[PDB]
Amino acid sequence: SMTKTSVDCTMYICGDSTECSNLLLQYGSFCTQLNRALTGIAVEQDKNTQEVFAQVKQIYKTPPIKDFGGFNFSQILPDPSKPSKRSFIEDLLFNKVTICAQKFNGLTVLPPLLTDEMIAQYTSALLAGTITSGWTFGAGAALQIPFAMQMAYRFNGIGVTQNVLYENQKLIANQFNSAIGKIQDSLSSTASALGKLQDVVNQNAQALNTLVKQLSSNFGAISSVLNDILSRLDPPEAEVQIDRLITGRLQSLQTYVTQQLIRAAEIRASANLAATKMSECVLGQSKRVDFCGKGYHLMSFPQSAPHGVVFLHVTYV
C-alpha cells in the first residue's frame, strides 16, 4: 500500500475564497474527476491490503506448547509482553522505516481499515496456520500436522527424499535457527535494508511536499496568496490574476493525480506479486523456479512491515 490521500481541490485551488470558488465553477468537472481519482486510489489501498494480508477468514492462534521439532520461531511470532503483537524481526522492520503543513493546506490522509495491529493479527494467523497446519488451512479445513512432519513433505516436493530431514533434522534445525539469527542481525545492522518500502514512504513524502510547495508557486500571478490579490485588486483585475493561480494549481493537482494513478498501478502490481507469493510461498510450496527466493522452496514466513509485506523464504541450496 501507499499513503491514502484525499485532496479537496475546492480548498487546494481556492483556499477559503468565495471569489476564486466562483471562477473554479467555470472549469466544472476538473475538480470532480480529481476527487474521484483520489477517492478511487484510497479505496484501492484497502483492497490491496486485504488481497495480500486478509487471505484467511479465521483468526488462527498459536498453541501454548511450542514443540515445533527444534525450530525456534520466537523472532517471527508475536510477543505477549508488548502492547502490539509484533515479533522481534517485525519490531526491527517498523523501527528501521519511519505532516502538519499538509493537513493545513487541504491535504487529508485517511487511516487504513486494517490498523497496524490488525495487519499484524493477520500475519500472526498466517504464521500460526502455516506452522501448525501447513498449506491445508488456505485450500480447505485447517488440518493439524506436526511441523517436523510438515517439513518432510516440503523436502519431498523439491525432489529430496523424506529420510534427509529425519536423518539430518538436528543439522537442518541448526541451519534455520542460525539463519534466522542472521535475519535479525542483518535487519538490525543495515539502515537501508527496507529500501523497497523506504521508496514508498519517500515517494509519498516527495509527492505531498511537491503538492504543498506548488501552493507558494506564482504560476505567473502577482502573488501565490489569493488574499494578497484580493486585498490589492478590484473584481476585474483580481479575477485575471486568480485565473493564473487556478490554471497552475489545477495543473499541479492533475500532475499529482497522474503520478498517483501511475504509482497506484506500481503498488497494484507489487500487491498482486505479494498476493501470489502469499498464496504460493506462504500458504503453499512453490515449484515455480526462483519465485519464492533463490533455491528449492521449502516454505516462507510472512512478517508485516511499514506499507508492505516481508517474506522470509526458506530454500534448500
Binding site: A54, V56, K57, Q58, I59, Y60, K61, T62, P63, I65, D67, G69, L113, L114, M118, Q121, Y122, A125, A128, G129, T132, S133, T136, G140, A141, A142, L143, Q144, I145, P146, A148, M149
Partner: protein, 41 residues
C-alpha cells in the same frame, strides 16, 4: 428499534489450532465446489 451502530471490525471467527507432535487431521469426506471468478477482457 433499529439504528446505525458503530463497532471495531472483527477480523474473522477465532480458532486456536489443536497442535500436537503426535496428532494429524485427515479429511474423511470432501466437497467438489464450483466457484465463479469474473475477469474483464
Amino acid at each position: 428499534s433499529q439504528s446505525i451502530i458503530a463497532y471495531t471490525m472483527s477480523l474473522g471467527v477465532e480458532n486456536s489450532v489443536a497442535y500436537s507432535n503426535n496428532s494429524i487431521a485427515i479429511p474423511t469426506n470432501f466437497t467438489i465446489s464450483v466457484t465463479t471468478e469474473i475477469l474483464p477482457v
